[PDB]
From a paper:
To explore the molecular mechanism underlying the conformational state-specific dichotomic Gal3 oligomerization process, we set out to reveal the assembly state of Gal3 directly on inactive bent-closed α5β1 integrin via cryogenic electron microscopy (cryo-EM). A homology model of rat α5β1 integrin86 was fitted individually into the density maps of the headpiece (flexible fit) and leg piece (rigid-body fit). From the glycans of the α5 chain headpiece that point towards the additional cryo-EM density that we ascribed to Gal3, the one at position rN356 (hN307 in human α5) is a Gal3-binding competent complex-type glycan. Based on GlycoSHIELD modeling, it was indeed possible to position another Gal3 CRD for interaction with a galactose residue on the α5-rN356 (α5-hN307) glycan. With α5-rN918 (α5-hN867), α5-rN356 (α5-hN307) constitutes the core glycan pair, which is common to Gal3 dimers, trimers, and tetramers that all bridge the head and leg pieces of bent-closed α5β1 integrin (top, blue dashed line zoom). Our structural data pointed to the intriguing possibility that Gal3 oligomers might physically bridge membrane-proximal (leg piece) and distal (headpiece) parts of α5β1 integrin that face each other in the inactive bent-closed conformer. Specifically, it appears that only on bent-closed α5β1 integrin N-glycans from head and leg pieces are arranged such that Gal3 oligomerization can be nucleated (left).
Integrins exist in a continuum of conformations between bent-closed non-ligand-bound (also termed inactive) and extended ligand-bound (also termed active) states. Glycosylation is required for integrin functions. Membrane distal N-glycosylation sites within the β-propeller domain of α5 and at the βI domain of β1 integrins are required for heterodimerization and efficient cell surface expression. For the conformationally switchable cell adhesion glycoprotein α5β1 integrin, we find that only the bent-closed state arranges N-glycans to nucleate the formation of up to tetrameric oligomers of the glycan-binding protein galectin-3.
Residue numbers in the entry:
A (entry chain P): 94 to 691
B (entry chain Q): 25 to 504
Amino acid sequence: FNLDAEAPAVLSGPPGSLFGFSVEFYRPGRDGVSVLVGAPKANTSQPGVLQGGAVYVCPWGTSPIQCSTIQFDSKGSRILESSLYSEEPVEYKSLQWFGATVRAHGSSILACAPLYSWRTEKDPQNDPVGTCYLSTENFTRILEYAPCRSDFGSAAGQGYCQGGFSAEFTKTGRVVLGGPGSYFWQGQILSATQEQISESYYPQYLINPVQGQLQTRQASSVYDDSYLGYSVAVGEFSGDDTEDFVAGVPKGNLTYGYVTVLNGSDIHSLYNVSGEQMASYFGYAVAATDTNGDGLDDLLVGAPLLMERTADGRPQEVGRVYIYLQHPEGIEPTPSLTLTGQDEFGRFGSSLTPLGDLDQDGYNDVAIGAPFGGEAQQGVVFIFPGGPGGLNTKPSQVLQPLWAAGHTPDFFGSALRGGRDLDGNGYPDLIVGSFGVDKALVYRGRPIISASASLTIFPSMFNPEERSCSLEGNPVSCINLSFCLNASGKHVPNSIGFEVELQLDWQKQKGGVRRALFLASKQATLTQTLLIQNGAREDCREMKIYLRNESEFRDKLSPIHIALNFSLDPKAPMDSHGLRPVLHYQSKSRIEDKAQIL
Amino acid sequence: NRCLKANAKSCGECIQAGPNCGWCTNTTFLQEGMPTSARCDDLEALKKKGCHPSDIENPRGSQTIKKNKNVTNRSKGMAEKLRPEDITQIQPQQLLLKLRSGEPQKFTLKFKRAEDYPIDLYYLMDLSYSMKDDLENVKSLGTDLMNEMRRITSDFRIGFGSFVEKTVMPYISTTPAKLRNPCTSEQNCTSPFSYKNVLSLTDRGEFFNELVGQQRISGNLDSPEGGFDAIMQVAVCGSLIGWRNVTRLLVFSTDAGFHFAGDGKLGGIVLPNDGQCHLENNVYTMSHYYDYPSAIHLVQKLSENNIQTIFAVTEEFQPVYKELKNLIPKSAVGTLSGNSSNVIQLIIDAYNSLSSEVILENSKLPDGVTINYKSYCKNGVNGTGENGRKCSNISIGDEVQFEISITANKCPNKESENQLKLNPLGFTEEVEVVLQFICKCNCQSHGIPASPKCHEGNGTFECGACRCNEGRVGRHCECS
Ligand SMILES: *[C@@H]1O[C@H](CO)[C@@H](O)[C@H](O)[C@H]1NC(C)=O
Ligand SMILES: *[C@@H]1O[C@H](CO)[C@@H](O)[C@H](O)[C@H]1NC(C)=O
Ligand SMILES: *[C@@H]1O[C@H](CO)[C@@H](O)[C@H](O)[C@H]1NC(C)=O
Ligand SMILES: *[C@@H]1O[C@H](CO)[C@@H](O)[C@H](O)[C@H]1NC(C)=O
Ligand SMILES: *[C@@H]1O[C@H](CO)[C@@H](O)[C@H](O)[C@H]1NC(C)=O
Ligand SMILES: *[C@@H]1O[C@H](CO)[C@@H](O)[C@H](O)[C@H]1NC(C)=O
Ligand SMILES: *[C@@H]1O[C@H](CO)[C@@H](O)[C@H](O)[C@H]1NC(C)=O
């Protein structure tokens, strides 16, 4: 494949404030297309709150990608004067994370803020309810969504819900929200489309439930400490176009985690598959796309902490991701693939997001990040390629950071999100975040060109006696050499430059007498720049080649090998996005042919 | 033949190619046209072709035991003798074995659990309000353990460590739970703490009673299960605790489950555990910065310290720690009484159950080498088809004899030998096997660099002909 690892095009963040903890695309393939980055521990504007954090939009599209801050809420009016009392005024909002889970689709964006803390009306507490800030229609108005902030707020109720720890916008506009610590730590999934939250918002009620609201019911005390909602995603697991929700339960089923899928218009248990090792953190990162090329999406569950005893027998810390393949019956069976890791402490599977058809063969890629993989344990992001039978174990590109080793881990791949095209050339671009020290990488996907070159000789045999050609008035035996080139590639400029190198009798040792030479150039090698129209018919160049005099060489038995090599022109200008096209890995850059002597 | 397919130039890629592959110092059978490959072939093929027996070089590995100690068998009880002594349980301690690629080198080792081996015990219990009925009696039987465990060994030291939950935001605050228990009049019931050790490993039995009578409790936290960080800091650093290099134990007194790495992310904690001791003034300090150990980061640093952890679980949450038992090698789980009044017999039976079990482990194997395991344990139970690194059901002083075969493979570590240690978990003494491979024939030691036969110095003449330098080919490196 190809994703241009040599030109990272990095962003940057403020010092001492973690950056790129959540990175997402905004208005992809359209005007003002930008990249959103979350910095939960960064400093905000309000003096009252420390480590408030804010997400920064970045107007991507220029060579310098410096960017400012967007202002969700720089206020203190809402928090203060609960029931109008200066004494015991507020439980301070400081240290609240604000960029742990940010996401956006269309023009409406959500910035969930876990670890939000608030004092209930009844009695002073330290309840981590958690809120998500919603802004719609080009930042015209801001909305506040804390569905776990209700009257019955207690550590055994919804007080420690911490809603916002995992969210994603469904394609229909629904906001799907996950609260890991709801109902004495069994978890709760909260979903309600934009219409109800827009209509049912009232600021002065600190407690304002959304009318249309879909939540998981309270479970019995036997399901304590399950953490439902640690990671949630949307898919198409139901046969209908209706999008189903998938959520992983990390510590459910007596520490053997399991992942659930839920019915569309009403929250229900549906299908749900369990982990295979205790304390594996099944469901740390769930994902769902059509990784099979059949139209029905596939699950993807990663378990960062896991066993794999080896020839030595020493246990290691290698995570494996699990592929679950949907079927026309709609039910996911036992695992169908497993892409394990190969690093000592790399939490393989900590992040799992899809890419849509990077090779544009109809098969969608995936990207898995190992925050501590690779040498110097700096972090690695793999890209396994989609295939007819599923993903391939060979991870294609293995992307590594370009910086130097530091005392603190740089947490490469701790947050990523690909999918929708950013540059706009019909080729998706990937993003990664490295919250170690202020490092967010936005990558680019290069165009692919499939090229074919055909070499022909007429006649295939040199006749020493038939000196049909004349060299400076001297009759010489000659045969015709013709080569044709055909190239085709999507989203590529209509004219593509190739470098074509022709070599004669190339297998002769350095210093050996080349038996065949070019008639025009009297040499053994020819280089030429060719411009081939994209998708057009093959361009052919015909040339005549001549054999030297019999006195100049003794070898009439070994055939005269002719080699045809080609690769992209290195001097070709980059595209509008600064990318250089790549030759397909199946393209045979070297074609060899031979002519004999009668 | 594969050795013929190896296309050997030097003795190296003929030794590395295969076990039976061999050279010929005469090199008169070899035809001038045929390349350097044709020399390297099987032993029988060489004698068929007429190469002389001394002219073939096929060194075979062997085992040599440099360090051997007479195992302790001194009489006691029946006859008068001096009791105190030092330790010796494994007879071969340091031995040298030279290896060939594909040679299954084999040796034997023997071990018996020495009687009267001093031990160290450590109590790690959660000072949670669910242990109010257990702390009341546990302090009483500190000296009772001193008296009861006198059968095991002449002397042993025992210390105390306490922990409850963590100071992270999500896991620290309580429900209303209107109890308001007047615990003490001295206001010593301080806030919950990540970890704290009060008494180190000491022989004085009175010290337990004296220093644990002043141990308080933590008040009714909601689902507090923060123990793995404590059992990490205990095992990772032992100089401060005083951890002595004998058969050592650790008691984990628990209620209702535990946490594992990736939970602090709820509380805004992302960095993994360092694996470095952080104990300033006998109390865990670097708690809020680092996350919990994974269940397996615990396994590596528990095994690299020979720590034997004992589990004091209460009836409800037994299955979870039962599966923990199969996860963590060399650990035991025990059903504790409701009032914690059976911890003495629990510890006795748990030590008895651990003692019969000896498990072996190696460290950092080189790439090529692989090790298989067979064990001859007790009378019977000789099984090796199911891999045998364990034996049990042994009595005190019984004999066992494991066998180790080290099978080499394609080996590029020509840096002489590599050191690897085989240690039964729980015992300090280990067998370390200096493991040297053969990457050169003996005739190569006498090779002449820039030899005249090598087209006037264009190669090294060794073992009957010339190894050509870079950029030179031919029988005598005559060509560039
Ligand atoms: C601003 O936020 C940064 C986050 O890295 C923090 O280090 C700094 O102390 C904060 N400063 C103030 C004045 O709050
Ligand atoms: C929406 O906000 C951003 C701010 O620059 C930008 O895309 C644009 O100016 C706004 N929309 C319109 C229609 O102006
Ligand atoms: C819980 O998970 C285990 C896998 O370790 C499985 O064997 C068991 O059947 C599960 N329990 C239920 C009730 O499904
Ligand atoms: C699954 O979702 C549908 C909406 O498409 C809803 O009627 C119900 O919850 C489920 N359908 C059934 C049970 O037929
Ligand atoms: C798993 O799915 C079944 C239905 O398929 C559901 O009834 C059950 O509650 C789920 N597991 C748990 C632990 O809830
Ligand atoms: C105990 O043995 C270990 C070997 O693992 C050694 O490092 C340590 O110094 C020894 N301690 C004493 C007191 O002999
Ligand atoms: C044991 O604990 C129970 C609480 O379940 C208590 O009622 C009982 O009095 C305790 N017994 C002793 C001897 O401490």
